[PDB]
Design a binder for this molecule. Structure first.
Ligand SMILES: Cc1cc2nc3c(=O)[nH]c(=O)nc-3n(C[C@H](O)[C@H](O)[C@H](O)COP(=O)(O)OP(=O)(O)OC[C@H]3O[C@@H](n4cnc5c(N)ncnc54)[C@H](O)[C@@H]3O)c2cc1C
Ligand SMILES: Cc1cc2nc3c(=O)[nH]c(=O)nc-3n(C[C@H](O)[C@H](O)[C@H](O)COP(=O)(O)OP(=O)(O)OC[C@H]3O[C@@H](n4cnc5c(N)ncnc54)[C@H](O)[C@@H]3O)c2cc1C
Lengths: 279, 93, 280, 82
């Protein structure tokens, strides 16, 4: 069961894209939070959205929610881990299930930056579960942004000679004794030919491999092969990325961050996505 | 294994796909690599290496990730779509 | 340097309005040219379901919401039609029949214009008031889309050896006896080196020059020097034209014609216009 | 006489566009000195007719540009012709 269009994100762009795709009798799936967008609900008063002078964020969020519910649009309350462009279609990966769709539209908003990772990505990791056998009997460091990262760190302890776990969140850590917890702020990854050490504010760690397990993945990693410049997804006038049949709209594209641009960008993506299904 | 080494010396670029059964991206690449081999029959030749079955091959070339595409001329780490791989071949030849 | 607005918005449709409210947000003086009714298409449209936040809302009802927004922000529409805009370099001079205005930045928001058959090939060989003296004692033909043409035709008839008037509107024509009325639809203009004849459906006219007087000018003519490709104004990601200080938004740029695209485009153009003013 | 030996902006006092062009032309000469002349069609119709000026605001180099044009376009055209 493959949908015609898959929308990544439930913000203004994602919803604006959704209603236009649903208007033209194409099957649509929207991945996101039960709450449309934290920014929509949080905004105190919005004067630059045309037609809703002086509307509260939560109040505007209500108007959008009514729109999709009245149109029979349901949000799939899951987070998208990865999206693999197969050529004719896109495979979407989620921990709870796997979906595939013929077209994709990205509405991810903003994500956290990476410190000196991209210098030696080949000799760095992102999957962890994929690369654990390679580092048998070697030093491994993990930067964890969520609980799933802790579990991967416990897994690494089985294979590696030494495992460091650096938590970026303040919580009790469910970790085996073998894992060493390092409560410091990552700064830089350094190596001559390959990664050799991870430098923190007040500590230095000599390690063969560094894994950065992130809660909010960047667009480039979420969608392998996506061309990203200046920290925002590249899009042409029609909202097309470097990957054919993969669109992007909203804060992710990189223009001024506003609702009305976000909805417009989402609409243009959806209408063009529909066009490509035919011809 | 010997057959692969003989092929490496010959030629006509040769592409090595390093994958593991456990790694999800590696599985994705094999179908992409099969499609690439069918599309290209002359420019380059493709071979598939199971990292699980050929640990020696992997360590020698310093593979950094379970799913990696290698052609000495250039090294692509992680999953990539067909278009990106094809283009990288085109210039690199 | 008299009454120079920070930003001048051409058109009162969704794109034009979206730009206006954003320019007003950042304490920049703004003038919006357009109709008091804002946009005929908004009032005419039966219902909108793809404008996010309004479901099954009649066009006229949506138009009311837009009027409330600008009214609340202290934005008034100058109910005039903009005839020309001349890019001088540091500012834009805005010509109307009633008055003249100057603005630092311009935003274009006009959805559609009359098409021209075989006009652009021989435009050079055939602004009647500006070029009338050149055609003294020669045949000139006029295609009129408004009353101003009748007045211009009467003027031209005094200087030229022969004046033809091709009316596109059905109304009583106040024209001198010397001008001849030709009730047909133009088809094609023909000439080798210079204009020689204007071809109509059932008639052909031998003339030295042809003048085309339109009620709704195209963007290319409205703004001398504007680059237009495929019948729509060319714009980059920031809504910048080939002119360094001229933006465009809405149906005029091209692509899908939709409210949400129009407002988004208007917002990006305005915000970019404000940013350039801020740097200085 | 000097102009003929070297061998131009054609403008008229009634045409608004031609007025705008004048000052634009003047800025161009000041802006670029090294790599302009104004012809009044009213006083020199013979000069205009001889060259075939068919629209009042016309810029003549090799190349003729009829109608108002902005500074950037005119400068680019001049540079291209060189
Ligand atoms: C406090 C505040 C006030 C603001 N006020 C205004 C204003 O007055 N006027 C104005 O024009 N703009 C305002 N903005 C900015 C504007 O709201 C945002 O640009 C716009 O909301 C962005 O919409 P978007 O969907 O593009 O991004 P978002 O709205 O953030 O969309 C993000 C959505 O995508 C989901 N998502 C993200 N990543 C994934 C993933 N990997 N997998 C699955 N789902 C994912 C997120 O959970 C979220 O649902 C304001 C912002 C803030 C914070
Ligand atoms: C019946 C009908 C129903 C529609 N329904 C929908 C729908 O449901 N959803 C959707 O997304 N789209 C719909 N559209 C199309 C949509 O309305 C247009 O894409 C949108 O109106 C474009 O807005 P705009 O501001 O860019 O241009 P316009 O709305 O066309 O701008 C017109 C305004 O610009 C002024 N103007 C134009 N030229 C000049 C000039 N030279 N000088 C001074 N003023 C000028 C005019 O006075 C006028 O007020 C519909 C259209 C019609 C006719």
């Amino acid at each position: 069961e493959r949908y015609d269009i898959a929308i990544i994100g439930s913000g203004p762009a994602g919803l604006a894209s959704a209603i236009n795709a649903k208007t033209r009798n194409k099957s649509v799936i929207v991945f996101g939070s039960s709450d449309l967008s934290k920014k929509l609900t949080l905004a105190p008063v919005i004067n630059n959205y045309l037609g809703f002078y002086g509307i509260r964020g939560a109040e505007l969020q209500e108007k959008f929610k009514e729109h999709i519910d009245n149109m029979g649009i349901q949000i799939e309350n899951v987070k998208v881990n990865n999206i693999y462009a197969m050529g004719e279609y896109f495979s979407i990966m989620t921990s709870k299930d796997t979906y595939e769709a013929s077209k994709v539209i990205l509405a991810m908003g903003m994500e956290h930056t990476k410190p000196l990772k991209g210098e030696d990505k080949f000799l760095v990791g992102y999957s962890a579960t994929c690369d654990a056998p390679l580092y048998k009997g070697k030093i491994v460091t993990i930067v964890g942004y969520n609980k799933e990262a802790e579990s991967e760190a416990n897994y690494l302890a089985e294979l590696a000679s030494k495992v460091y776990y650096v938590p970026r969140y303040k919580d009790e850590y469910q970790l085996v004794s073998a894992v060493e917890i390092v409560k410091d702020v990552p700064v830089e990854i350094v190596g001559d030919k390959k990664v050799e050490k991870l430098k923190l504010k007040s500590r230095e760690l000599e390690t063969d491999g560094v894994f950065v397990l992130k809660d909010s993945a960047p667009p480039e990693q979420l969608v392998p092969g996506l061309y990203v410049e200046d920290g925002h997804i590249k899009v042409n006038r029609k909202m097309e990325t470097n990957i054919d049949g993969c669109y992007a709209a909203g804060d992710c594209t990189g223009k001024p961050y506003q609702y009305m641009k976000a909805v417009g960008e989402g609409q243009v993506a959806a209408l063009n996505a529909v066009e490509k299904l035919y011809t | 294994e010997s057959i692969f080494d003989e092929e490496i010396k010959t030629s006509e670029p040769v592409i090595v796909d390093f994958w593991a059964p456990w790694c999800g991206p590696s599985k994705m690449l094999g179908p992409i690599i099969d499609e690439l081999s069918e599309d290209l029959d002359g420019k380059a030749k493709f071979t598939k290496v199971n990292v699980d079955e050929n640990p020696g091959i992997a360590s020698k070339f310093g593979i950094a990730s379970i799913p990696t595409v290698m052609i000495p001329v250039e090294t692509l780490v992680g999953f990539r779509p067909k278009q990106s791989i094809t283009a990288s071949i085109e210039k690199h030849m």
